[PDB]
Every structure is written in C-alpha cells, then in structure tokens.
C-alpha cells in the first residue's frame, strides 16, 4: 500500500486526488524540514508545483500565528508513489498540514484523509471530485475525511456509504489541525497560537 | 459548490469561461498579495499561464491608474476547483478585479459574474462564448453579468432568460469596479483616481 | 469582432500575420507606456520576443531623431485576439508604430493595416505571407495596407480581390507614420524630427 | 551484455523503473564524487531533479551519522541506457546508495536490484510499479531485488516469476546497505556509524 | 521578393539554407550594431540560436585580428522573412560575414550567396544540402556562391547549370571577405589584419 | 564531404551514429574551447542537447586529466553537417575526445572512427547499432573503429569486411586517447596522468 490507514506519523498526511476523469486516489504526502543553514522547497515529479504553492501559502500562516519562519528551513516534500494521470488540488491542505506537522513535531492521524485548497489567509477553499475522493477514501479503509465546508452539497453518497466514513467539513486550517493532530500538550499549545 | 453567489469577499471574483466549446461555466478566482520579502505571480493547474499573463497585462492599470508596482508583491491566484477543458479569457477582467480588490482591501459582490479581456489601456474588449457564459451565470443563480460593450449584440437569450439576469455592458475597467466593489469610503477614493 | 476597422485611436495598430500555411489574420497590437515608477517591455505569449525586438529597434530610432529616450519607461505591448500557430514578423512595424503612437500620444488610422520588419536604421524590410496578409485585410473590410516596398512583386490577388484595398509600398519608418498618424500639430512637430 | 548483473563495483547500483505503464526496467545509476575548489550535483536528463533530491536526502543522512559533509564535493550522477518515457522514484534509493558507495569507496553487489524512495531521516518509502519492476529484475537475470517493506502486498507474482528471485523488504537505508555493500573493514566501520 | 540580387549593402548577406529535406532557399540576413552603453545578441524566430552562435564565433575572430570587441556592442540580427521548415547551418558564415560588415562599415556584394559553418578559429567547415543550396542560388538569379572547400565533391550540377553560376570554394573567413566585401581602402586595411 | 578521412586535427573526431533505424553514419564533431567571458557549452541544431549532456557528464574526468574546470571555459561544439533523424550516443566518447583534444592542443587521428558512452568513472559502456556504425565507417574509407569491449559480440562482419577495418574494443577512456591522439611528448605526459 502507498499509504498508511492507521496510527500516527509525523509529517505524513493522506490527501486525496482524482485520476483519469472519474476515480479518486489516496495521495499520501511526507514533509520534512532541515535547517537551511534562503530556504528551498524540494519536491519532484508531476505534483511539485502543487507542493511549492501549498508551502508558500502555509509559510505565511506559520510566520503570522507562531514563531517559526519557513524562509530559514528546507522543506522536503514527496508524494509517496508516482502520480501520472493525477490532478491534485491548488495549495492542497494535506501538504500544508504535513508541513505544519513536521515543523511542530506533532503526529498526524492517518486514519483521516482530507482535500482542500488553502488560501494564504488560512481558509479552506472548495475543490473538485469530492464524491470520487471520499469513495477512494472509503475504499482505502479510511475512517474520516476532511472536506471544505463549501463542498458539503457535492457529497453524492449512497446511504450505505454514509455510514462507512465520517465527513467533517472545515473552512479554516486550524480546524483541520484540531481534527488530525495527535492529542497532547504540543497540540494544545499550537491550537492556542491560532486564535484567529 | 466552488463559487459563492452573494455577499462581498476581498479578492474573490466569479469570472465566466467556456468548458470545451459546448457550454459556459463560472470560473471563481481568489487573488491574494503578500510583500515580496523579485515579485512573482504564483498559480498552478491548468489555467496557470493565463493567470500570470493576465496579471502581467493588468499590472499596467494596477500601478498606472493607482498605487503599487506588482514586482514589489507576490500575487497568489487560484481557480477555485479544477478546470480541464476550460478556455479562459486572455487578459481577463476577473483576474484584474480580483487583484485590484485584494490589494486595496475592498470586497467584491459575488452575485455579479463577469467576462471580458482588459486592454493595456483599460478598455474592456469583446470575448467569445458570451451567450453560453451568461446562460451558466443564470443556471448558477448569479444575479448580474458584466460583459464587453462589444458583445452586446452577441447576447441571444430567450424571453424567459432575459428577465432572469441583468446584463451590464462595460467599456472600461473603472465601470467594472464601480459595478462590483463594495460601497464605501475606500471605493470612493479609488474611483476618484480612475480619472481622467 | 474584437478589434477596429475605421476611426483613430492612440497606440493601437492593425498589424497582419499568417496562422501558418496561408491563413492571414488581422493582429491588433495595443501599446501603453508609463514611467518605470531601469524600464522593461512587458509582453506575454509566443510573440513576446518580437515585441521586445520591435521595441529595441524603435528606441534606437526615436532616441536618434527626437532625442526622446525610451529607457526610463515601461512599454506594455498586447496582442489582441485568441490565436495559436501565429508566425509573426521580426521587429514587426505594427509594434513599433504602436509604441511611437503611444509615446507621442498621436492617434492611428484604424482603417489601415500594415506588415513589415524594422531595421535599427529604420528601414522597412520585406516579410512572408504578403498575399495572405492583404487578403485578411480585405476580408476584415480595411481600406489601406502598408507593405514593405520590396514585397511589391509577391502581391498576387485574383479577381475577387484586386481593386478592393489601397495597397501602400514603403521603404522607411517615416513613410509608414506619414500614412497612419492623425494630422495636426504633433504629427507635424514629430515628422520634421525625422529629417531635422 | 549492456549493464552489469554479476560481482562488485564502486558507485554503481542496479535501480528499477518503469517505462510508464506495465513495463518495468533495470536502470543502472553510476555515481562519482570529487572534492570541490561550494560543490554541486551534476546530473543530466529528465530525471536530474530526482538525482538532486536523492543526493540532498543522503547528505543529511551522512552528516548526521558519519559526519562526512557532502557540500565540499561534486557528485556526478549518470543514468545508464537509452530509456525514454521512464517514470522515476522520488529520492530514489539506487541513487543515494550509489553516492554512498562512491563517497566511502565501497563496492556494490550487482546481483541486486532495488527500488524505494528515501526520506531525510533514512526511511525507505513504497513506490509504484512494484510487480513490474520485480519482473524486470527477473527478465534481466538478477538474484535479489530490494523492495520497500510497505510494498510487500503489491507483490503479485504468478507461476512463471514465483520462486525466481529473492525479494528483500526493507524499511531503512542501513538495511539496504547491509544487503548490497561488499563485506569487510569499511562496511563494518560504516555500519556502526549509523545505528 | 525577400533578398537583393545586385549591388552592395552594409550588413546584408545572401545566405543559403534548405527547406523540407531538399529544396533550397536563399536566406538573407541583416546585422546591425549599436554601442551597448554587456552586449547582447538580439535575434528572434526559428534561426536565432544559429545567429547567437555565428556571433559568438566571429567575436573571438574579430578580437584576435582587429582588436575591436563585440562584448561592448549590441548585435541585432534578422532573417529577412520567416523560415519555418528550415535548417540553418551551425555557426553560419553568412551571419558572421554580415556582422564583420556592420562593424567595419564595408558593403557586402549582394550578387554572391554563401554557405558554410564558421569555427571559432576562422575555418569554413562543410555543410549539408549544397547542391539544393546552389540550385536555389541559380533559381534566384545569383551570380556566385561561396561554399566550403570540403563540399566540392558534393556540387552535383548538369552541364547547363555549371555555366550559370560561379562556385567559389573557401576554407577560411578571410577568403569569404576578400570575395564579398566591396573594394576600397577599408577592405585593403581589413585584409592586411587577417594575415 | 562532411568529415576528414586522414591526417590529424585538434578537436576533431569522427564519431559514429544511427540514421533513423536503417543504417550507421559518420558523425564528425569539432570542439573548441575559449576562456569564459561562468562557462557554457554552446551547440545548436538537432543534437545540441546530447553535446551538452556529453560535456556535462565528462567534466569530472575532463578536470582530473587536464585540471581545467569546464565552468572556467566556454566549449563550442559543432557536428559538421545537419543530422535530422540521428541518434547520438549519450555520454559520447567522441565528444569527450574532441573536448580533451581541444583543451590539450593535441591532434586526433581522423582515420579512426569511434562509438561508445563514457561512464562518469571513465569506463566505456556499450552502445546500440555497432555493425551498422562500423559499416558506415567501412563505406566512409575509415581505417579503424574503436568500440566498447562489451559490443565485441555485436560486431557481425560479414567478411571481406573484416579485412577492411580494424575493430579496436576498449573499456576505458585512456585507451581511446592512446589509440587516437597524435604521438609526441604532449600525449606521453597526458597518458602518464591516467592512474591512481
């Protein structure tokens, strides 16, 4: 499997994408950071413009709400596996979440997938293919799926499939973080910083 | 749903496009500006070139009628959703309003769709697919549609469809802003600078 | 259409192109010049390197004969219309003529198209696709087509096409301007300048 | 033959790739490192950004464990053969393993192919086309193929491929090395470096 | 028509090229120089890499024999017309000759075509399509064509065509010049330098 | 004729290649080197990417055997003639030999053709089209052909042909230079640096 469907890992997020025109796929992301000792964003293959964009957009939300400054770090991103035919989302939230997870040292729940376009300002924007994505997530044996609030009426799931996964709509990045970050002290202290 | 149909949002605009050749679609965009900290236009996905190009072309009236050089900013644009098969306006008036909007901190009416190419002189010039695009504005429950003054004769709706949306033809970008920017003191001061 | 067939309009020039084979097109150029708040030619698309080349060459020629130095100045050059397969002319004289107009604030006869390449010394060099260009100018209802003198013998034109446009051979940039600038005190001031 | 298959070689590793579809290939990487007069990573072709990513992740591995700084050296990464179309794996473990071999002047078992992506911290991450690649370690005649552990279950070999190669699942870069570096003094020096 | 067949012009040279994989065309070039007040080579369309290459090579030749320095000039180059379907010659001598012309102010003979590739050393290297280039030159009413010496055995013309054009084989750039530059004091002075 | 068949020239090498899939061809190359105005590799036409790949792959070796850095010079490469439809060897030995030749001032025997790719470790790796290449070398009236030791079994000469060319298989760079570089004191000195 290319994704983990349970437990908790630092820097790792199950995103979701569409392949060919219908189908959904889990899109697992890994982020790492090392001091740049300005900094670069390192990712390769077909979805790397998407990673640079998600990173550019979270760096500002990171500097603003907390201490750290992404300018001073290299941020090293992979999509775990290869992804031709795959259209990801602009400024994807799973990628920004992985980055936040890596910098804070706080593990992300892998039983939760998510799909979302991040505004610089930290909103969760709607996205396409949302039904086919939640389907892929149901298929991967995932438990929850985070989606933009404005994608709520796009969720076109047969009754049996709405019993199979929780659909948690969000409209800001802090709410994403409350949902997927592992419970503890470090999460408590990050969530505070995020009052607004 | 990928677009919002009422309310005012900063940097957010419901543009109009044509999916393949068959039909119009709403093309909601967000632009956001940050300090450059040389300045770039950041966009991804299938219409990224069109978005950089469009910001390139408008930067003209963005500095020249008003305040800032865009090479002093990073301009962050996204198309809210995925847009394969979609042909986007050259020099789009939606992107230029989105950007002018995000920079001035002046919110834009989401109930008003628009379509047109922005000349380097601030004219709004004719676009194709105007009847299609408006038909999509109508189907999306948008209340008004700004179009090029030159397309006035290409609007070929039925009797019914002509009562459902207000079509507003514009010849210049000041008019587009006048029709979408939120009333306020800030709007007033910005309009007084589109002198002549 | 998107463009302009009669009238006088500043910094806007009905150039001509080929779509590759033998499918002539009217190609409106629009130019705008503002102070750089050095300068730059801001142009988009595949013809942008020709926009720069035509700019360069008209700077030399302008500097030399009016002393006006176009170097503290941002020249925006826009191509009007939605074309692919666009072969353009090196140093194209449409772009040059536009810039001059724009700089000098003197209107251009919209009923006139032109095709040509400009040298640094400001000759008008011959170009491909002369018959096609002239047929697109006819097919657009234009009255006058400026071509290079040396292309005079590459003009064909069947019956359904001769006697249908005034075809104007030129060897120099003042010639081109002499036919297309609007008459008055400023075209007068500037025309003696090229001579001196 | 074109490539190697038998024996031990500084700096060269039989990677595995895909020519897109169901279509695996043996993809040898040769690496060479000189000290610089910082340094840079010289790779050409459609996979050079990945040669850079593989290197950048192994520098972090090497400077933490070993301490060797690879900033002081030019790393030349060459891909063997005229493959077109060719998907690569990010931070590819063949590329890192080649570099490490070059840097520490210790030979690689050619009888082994590998696929995997390397993370900064030294995990080896599951990769696509994993049955395709194993099949091509077979039509090449190789003995072992190293595969990421999290890929076990995307092994689906048939009759005519079952029993033909030794599949080696791994989670960690030390592990990879254990299995391909030639045994002796320098391997043993370098293993304890890590732990 | 796109090229001048007669008389003399500063910075203008009738080159020759092939369209499709046969047919020749006359390829006219203009070069012009302006002080850089660093220099850049300005040229656009499908042949511009060739143009910046011809100039890089004639640079080092101009400097070495004349002292002048193309680094501090802007060199502006056009192909007169658009030349889709066309291959130009590597480093083509018709470009380099238009450049030495522009810079020295000496007219080029418009009634002589030329084809060849210029080495940074001043040698005229052979080229392909030489017969189709010659035919094109004959068809256009050109009187002489300069070709690389090593291309003599590739000149394959019927007897009727032999009579119609002068073929002039060269091996170095100074021969080109001797052959196309207008006669006078400035030519005599230039040729003295290349010796 | 596009190549020389006898004598010795600085920076000139008769490479060998494959025109479409029918047959082999003589690929003559010149390399000239000059001080950098950092250093580039200058090549045009159909095989310019290859040239650059090659000089790129060989520069380590180029620096251990002179001790010039390739970033301290401009390498001007031409293939003499036009070759559309031609597959060059990657990491071409003939391009390395031309370069190394140009830099040392040491002439190369033109009577010797070669084919081969250069490992970053100075090894000569097998290449496709050997019998084909050799057969163009026989028709060209070349006297020897150096090939990879590993293509020794791919040489299917169909005698009379065996008597016409000397086939010299190599496994190392030094041995290519030994077999083509003109005899003298400079060569001897150069051959001595190939070691540990």
Determine the 3-state secondary structure of E105 from DSSP: coil
One of 3.30.230.10, 3.30.70.580, 3.40.50.720, 3.40.50.2030 is the CATH number of B1-196, namely 3.30.230.10
Determine, for residues B53 and C44 on separate chains, whether the beta-carbon distance falls below 8 Å. yes
Burial class (CB in 10 A: 0-12, 13-18, 19+), E160: exposed
E35: helix, strand or coil:
strand
Instruction: Look at C1 and B126 and tell me if their CB atoms are within 8 Å.
Output: yes
E9 in contact with F, Cβ within 8 Å = no
Nearest to E31 by CA among E80, E71, E66: E80
Chain E interface, mutation test: which of C15, C120, C121, most E Cβ atoms within 10 Å? C120
Quick one: which of C91, C100, C90, C92 has its CA closest to C28? C92
Indicate if the alpha-carbon torsion angle E91, E97, E100, E102 is positive or negative: negative
Alpha helices (H) in chain F, listed in sequence order: 48-57, 59-65, 93-104, 130-140, 161-164, 173-180, 185-193
Please answer yes or no on whether A1 and D128 come within 8 Å at the CB atom: no
φ, ψ dihedrals at A129, nearest 5°:
60, 25
CB within 8 Å: D117 and A80: yes
Taking the C-alpha atoms of residue A157 and residue A131, their distance in angstroms, rounded to an integer, is 7
Shortest CB distance from A57 goes to which of B1, B45, B76?
Answer: B76
C77 CB near a chain B CB, below 8 Å? yes
D153 part of contact set with chain A, CB < 8 Å: yes
Backbone angles phi, psi at C178, to 5 degrees: -45, -30
Paired with B103 in beta bridges are none
Please report the number of interchain residue pairs, chain B to chain C, with beta-carbon separation below 8 angstroms: 43
Q: Which residues, including other chains, have CB under 8 Å from residue D153's CB and lie 6 or more apart?
A: A1
- Would you call C121 a catalytic residue per the annotation? no
Pairwise CA distance, residues E131 & C10, whole Å: 51
Sequence-distant (≥ 6) Cβ neighbours of residue B192 within 8 angstroms = none
Among all chains, which residue has been given the structure tokens 């048939």? D158
User: Which tokens sit at D75?
Assistant: 């790393």
Handedness of CA C170, E42, B118, B133 (dihedral sign): positive
CA B138 from chain centre, in angstroms, equals 17
Q: Which chains touch A (3+ CB pairs under 8 A)? A: B, D
Helix (H) or strand (E) holding F23: strand F23-35
- Considering the candidates D92, D101, D117, D133, report the single residue annotated as catalytic: D133
Q: Experimental method for this entry?
A: X-ray
SS3 sequence of chain C: CCCCCCCEECCEEEEEEECCCCCEEEEEEEEEEEECCCCEEECCCCCHHHHHHHHHHHHHHHHHHHCCCCCCEEEEEEECCCCCCCECCCCEHHHHHHHHHHHHCCCEECCEEECCEECCCCEEECCCCHHHHHHHHHHCCCCEEEEEHHHHHHCCCCCCCCCCCEEEEECEHHHHHHHHECCCHHHHHHHHHCCC
The length of chain B is: 196
Residue positions of E annotated with a catalytic role: 90, 133
Q: Nearest Cα to B5, choosing from B143, B147, B106?
A: B143
Crossing angle of the two packed helices C185-193 and C48-66, in degrees rounded to 10: 80
The closest CB to that of D50, out of A1, A34, A44, belongs to A44
**DSSP for A114-177, written as a single string:** E--EE-TTSBEE--S-HHHHHHHHHHTT--EEEEEGGGGGG----HHHHTTSEEEEESBHHHHH
Within 10 angstroms of residue F22's Cβ, the number of other Cβ atoms is: 9
Let me know how long chain E is: 195
C-alpha distances out from residue D131 to A142, D17, D26, D164, F69, Å: 25, 11, 13, 13, 44
Whether F141 has its CB under 8 Å from any CB of chain E: the answer is: no
Contacts of A153 in chain B (CB under 8 A): 1
Strands A86-87 and A73-79, sheet pairing? unpaired
Of E18, E71, E117, the CB nearest to F78: E117
E115 reaches C (C-beta below 8 A): no
Strand partners, A35: A73
Q: Are F26 and F139 in contact (CB under 8 A)?
A: no
Could you tell me if F152 and F55 are in contact, meaning their C-beta atoms sit under 8 angstroms apart?
no
Long-range Cβ pairs for the range D65-73 (8 Å, 24+): D65/D193, D65/D194, D66/D104, D66/D190, D66/D193, D66/D194, D68/D103, D68/D104, D70/D33, D70/D39, D70/D99, D70/D103, D71/D38, D71/D39, D72/D35, D72/D36, D72/D38, D72/D39, D73/D33, D73/D34, D73/D35, D73/D36, D73/D39, D73/D103
Whole-angstrom distance, CA of residue C123 vs CA of residue C120: 7
Residues 6+ apart with CB under 8 A from C21: none
- H or E stretch covering E186: helix E185-193
Q: Which residue of F has its CA nearest to E49?
A: F44
Q: What residues of C are in contact with residue B69 (Cβ under 8 Å)?
A: 37
Which of the following is catalytic: F36, F90, F111, F119? F90
Subunits that touch chain D (at least 3 Cβ pairs < 8 angstroms)? A, F
Distance, in Å, from the CA atom of E180 to the CA atom of E15, rounded to the nearest integer, reads 12
Instruction: Please return the burial class of F149, using the count of CB atoms within 10 Å of its CB with bins 0-12, 13-18 and 19+.
Output: middle
The CA-based diameter of chain B, rounded to the nearest angstrom, is 54
CA distance E142 to E129: 17
Convert F48-84 to b/e letters by CB count within 10 Å (16 or more is b): bebbbbbbbbbbbbbbebeebbbeebbbbbbbbbbbe
Q: How far is F78 from chain E (nearest CA, A)?
A: 7
Q: Is there a contact between F137 and F145 (Cβ–Cβ < 8 Å)?
A: yes
State which CATH number among 2.40.110.10, 3.30.230.10, 3.20.20.80, 3.90.226.10 fits the domain covering E1-195.
3.30.230.10
Residue from B110, B67, B112, B75 nearest B95 by CA? B75
D11 contact F CB<8A: yes
- Residue B38 neighbours by CB distance under 10 Å: 6
Q: Is D60 on the interface with A (CB under 8 A)?
A: yes
Chain F residue numbers with beta carbons less than 8 Å from the beta carbon of D44 are 52-53, 56-57
Which positions in chain D touch F38 (Cβ < 8 Å)? none
CA distances from D59 to B78, D56, D121, F18 (A): 35, 5, 11, 40
Place of tokens 């093309």: B27
What residues in E contact F36, CB-CB < 8 Å?
A: none
Q: Is B133 a catalytic residue?
A: yes
Distance CA A8, CA A26 (A): 17
Q: Are strands E12-19 and F41-42 parallel, antiparallel or unpaired?
A: unpaired
B116 neighbors B27 (Cβ within 8 angstroms): no
Q: List, in sequence order, the alpha helices (H) in chain B.
A: 48-61, 93-104, 130-139, 161-164, 173-180, 185-193
Residues of E in contact with C155 (CB under 8 A): none
Neighbouring CB atoms inside 10 A of E20's CB total 9
Neighboring chain F residues of D78 at a CB cutoff of 8 Å: 57, 91, 119-120
| Chain B residues lying within 8 Å of A60, measured CB to CB | 34
Q: How far apart are CA E96 and CA E121, in angstroms?
A: 13
| Residue B76 forms contact with A (CB below 8 Å) | yes
Are D30 and F150 an interchain contact pair (Cβ–Cβ within 8 Å)?
A: no
φ/ψ of residue E106, rounded to 5 = -100, 130
> Smallest Cα–Cα separation from E181: which of E76, E107, E118, E115?
E107
3-state DSSP call for residue B65? helix
Instruction: Look at the block and give the residue holding tokens 């003599």.
Output: E152
Please check whether residue D169 touches F, CB under 8 A. no
């Amino acid at each position: 499997k290319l994704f983990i469907t349970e437990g908790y890992e630092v820097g790792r997020v199950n995103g979701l994408a569409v392949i060919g025109e219908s189908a959904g796929i889990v899109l697992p992301i890994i982020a790492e950071v090392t001091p740049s000792m300005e900094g670069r964003v390192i990712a390769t293959g077909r979805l790397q413009e998407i990673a640079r964009e998600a990173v550019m957009n979270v760096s500002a939300i990171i500097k603003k709400y907390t201490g750290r400054d992404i300018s001073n770090m290299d941020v090293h991103i992979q999509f775990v596996g290869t992804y031709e035919g795959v259209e990801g989302d602009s400024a994807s939230i799973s990628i920004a979440t992985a980055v936040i997870s890596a910098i804070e040292g706080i593990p992300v729940d892998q039983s939760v997938a998510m799909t979302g376009s991040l505004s610089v300002k930290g909103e969760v924007l709607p996205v396409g293919g949302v039904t086919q994505k939640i389907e892929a997530a149901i298929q991967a044996g995932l438990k929850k799926v985070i989606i933009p609030k404005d994608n709520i009426d796009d969720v076109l799931l047969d009754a049996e499939h709405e019993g199979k996964i929780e659909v948690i709509p969000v409209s800001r990045i802090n709410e994403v973080l409350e949902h997927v970050l592992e419970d503890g002290k470090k999460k408590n202290r990050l969530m505070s910083k995020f009052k607004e």
